[PDB]
Every structure is written in C-alpha cells, then in structure tokens.
Amino acid sequence: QFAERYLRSYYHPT
Amino acid sequence: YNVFPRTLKWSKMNLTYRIVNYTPDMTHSEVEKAFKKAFKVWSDVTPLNFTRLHDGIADIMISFGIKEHGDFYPFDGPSGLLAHAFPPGPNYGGDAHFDDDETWTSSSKGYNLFLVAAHAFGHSLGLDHSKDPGALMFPIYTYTGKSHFMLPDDDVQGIQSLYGPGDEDPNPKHPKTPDKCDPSLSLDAITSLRGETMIFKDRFFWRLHPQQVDAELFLTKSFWPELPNRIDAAYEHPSHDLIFIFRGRKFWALNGYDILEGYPKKISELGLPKEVKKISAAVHFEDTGKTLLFSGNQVWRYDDTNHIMDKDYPRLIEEDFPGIGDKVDAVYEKNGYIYFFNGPIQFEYSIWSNRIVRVMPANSILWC
Ligand SMILES: [Ca+2]
Ligand SMILES: [Ca+2]
Ligand SMILES: [Ca+2]
Ligand SMILES: [Ca+2]
Ligand SMILES: [Ca+2]
Ligand SMILES: [Cl-]
Ligand SMILES: [Cl-]
Ligand SMILES: [Zn+2]
Ligand SMILES: [Zn+2]
Secondary structure (H helix, E strand, O other): OOOOOOOEEEEEOO | OEEOHHHOOOOOOEEEEEEOOOOOOOOHHHHHHHHHHHHHHHHOOOOOEEEEOOOOOOOEEEEEEOOOOOOOOOOOOOOEEEEEEOOOOOOOOOOEEEEOOOOEEOOOOOEEHHHHHHHHHHHHHOEEOOOOOOOOOOOEOOOOOOOOOOOOHHHHHHHHHHHOOOOOOOOOOOOOOOOOOOOOOOOOEEEEEOOEEEEEEOOEEEEEOOOOOOOEEEEHHHHOOOOOOOOOEEEEEHHHOEEEEEEOOEEEEEEOOEEOOOOOEEHHHHOOOOOOOOOOEEEEEOOOOEEEEEEOOEEEEEEOOOOEEOOOOOEEHHHHOOOOOOOOOEEEEEOOEEEEEEOOEEEEEEOOOOEEEEEEEHHHHHOO
16 A cells, blocks of 8 residues: 655665 | 655654664673664754664664574675665664674774664664765765764755754764865875876875776775875875875885885974974975975975985075975876976976966866
8 A cells, every 4th residue: 555665774894 | 866766755853763683793781772873863964853762663773683684685794785775664664773793882993883773773763875975875985083973964964855954963063075176176196106197185085096077085094094184295106116195294115005114204204303293285296206395385305215314404495496385285296297287387397497377276187
C-alpha cells in the first residue's frame, strides 16, 4: 500500500 | 536540494520520536543528546517541534540493528551503509535505522551519531539526497570538524520549501557552497596535483583535469580528514609526489592521502620570523628546487635542496613582481607563467619577459 520504496541510505566507503 | 516525489511532507507541526533501543558504543545519555541535537538542527529553522516518547508508537521510531534487522534491507557490517530512513508517512514512515556494526561516537573517531542522525532525519522530514557536496543531505558521509555545526544553506532552503521558516534562527547566515560562475570569487590557495589543478575555497576544493571543462568539487575533509577546513597556501613537489599545505603557523606534507611522519611542523622551522603568522600563498619551481612563499607584501625564497632560506630574503612583492598589487591570495605556475591571485583578479606573469602579459577574473580558471 505504501512508499517504503523511497528508503534512503547514507553511505561511507571503505 | 531535492524533495521526494509527490512531495511527502508531514501534515502536523508537532512531531514525536522514540529511541526504541540503543547502541552499547555510547551511554544512553550521549545517544539521547545526539538525537536531541539532530532534531534541533531542523527545528531551529522550521515551525517543526519534536517530542520524545518513552513508550508507545511515535511518528519517528528510531532503532539500532545489525545485518538483517527486520525489514527488506539488511545492513552490511563496518562502513558502507551507515543508516537508512523512510520519508514521511504512517508506520515505517519517518523511521530511522542505524547500523550497529559501526562504532558510534560523539567525536571525530568512528562515526559521529549526531551527524548521521541529522542527515537521516532530513529524510524523515521529506528531503531526498542533494547533489551539493557541501549539503548535509549529500549521500556520502564526511566528518565536518569539531567546530560547532551549522546547517548548510542548501538544506535550509530545502526544508523551508516544505514547512516555511521558524520564528528565529539562532544563526541566520548559513554556509553556502561557493559559486564558480561568480566573477567576484577570490581563492584561498592553488596547486597542481598529479597534473590537475587543485583550487581551494573555504572548506572546499575544486579539482580540475586539463582535459575537462567542469571541475569536480570536494570537501577538503573528504580527502584529508586530519587537516583544517580552510587553508592559507598550497604547493607541490611533483618529484616526490608531495603536496604542502599551510594554515596559520603550521604546515603539513602530504603523500596522496597521507600526512608524512613528523607533520604538522611550525613554519618557523622553515626559517620564518616568529612574527610571520600566516603564509598567504606559495609556489614551487622544480627545475630550480626553489619555493616562493608570500605573506603580507613580502616574499621569501626557500631552497628546497639545501633545506634553508636563500640569503637575500625577504623581499617586497612590489620590487620583484611590479604591478600585481600588495598581496598574494594564491599563486601557481605553469609553462613559464606565474598566476597571481588578488581578490577577484588573476595576473598572468611571464617569467620570460618579467612582466604581466595578461589580466583576467580569478574565476576564469574554472572555465566560467
Ligand atoms: Ca513512523
Ligand atoms: Ca554498515
Ligand atoms: Ca557498533
Ligand atoms: Ca591564501
Ligand atoms: Ca600555490
Ligand atoms: Cl597558494
Ligand atoms: Cl603551486
Ligand atoms: Zn541519506
Ligand atoms: Zn532498516
């Protein structure tokens, strides 16, 4: 039913 | 900045959160402080209000988790993913999850909980990722320094395009990413580095490949976390793959991303008077082994072979480089030409004919 497709993820590289 | 499709914004101004669980990396008080701080960042510039609940369902449920932690989206261990959050909505809407495979801190080490949380809550309030490397909403983490946090201007505008302004912003002048098309742009420092121009301004640098027309813009801390945000002067030893960075009376030698053993050093070690309190600009000439260093209206020449100052120094810029003014903001050298920056102008100085041959706005180095 909902926009849990707009999960945004925060990132740092190794 | 970017908002979410359909412009998902909260309906009410009074919002609730709940710290469902905690990381062992920090005490409960520190975690609560970080989260409170993170919310304050946004509430300070909006009508939004945040209230913590100890029990029940809040709008923003906050949790720590490890790998598979209950949704479709497992965390990935140390680094990589730090956190994710959902945009405004019911249930998962607004929720924020933090990877407890990270080591969370209130310092420069590990990952700073307040910083990631402030970013994460931007999503929770309806901001998508920004393309501005200077924005909090940029997709890639960078510790921005122990200095007190100012929300960047791109994020203020984003959030205020959702909820309007607040009654009073505790510091209304928000940090802006410098604009390369602005003909009033002045520069902090310039060097080449592996054949590319590095142009420092504020806490940023542009890196520009000679084959490119659009410079790449970075936070200085993206490259050299243990260096200052703002630098005074920069120069290169291409023979040794070393860049030298000046700020106040300290200077560093860098090999790629690495501060050489023994740095920072005092500039006095270079043979500077103790009353010289910053180097304003610097340039090295490799076919001579000589580095020029500027401060106020004077120049020193340093012998990079014999490791001492040359004897006839300091001299006046007005004597050795007539016509470029009384200060040097930044300087670099290319093809027998020295490029002197003074405010919004750059002077192209020919070593060959010992005269200024061309004058143009400082920003034109960025193809603007
Ligand atoms: Ca929720
Ligand atoms: Ca991770
Ligand atoms: Ca952990
Ligand atoms: Ca400077
Ligand atoms: Ca320089
Ligand atoms: Cl410089
Ligand atoms: Cl240089
Ligand atoms: Zn994000
Ligand atoms: Zn999750």
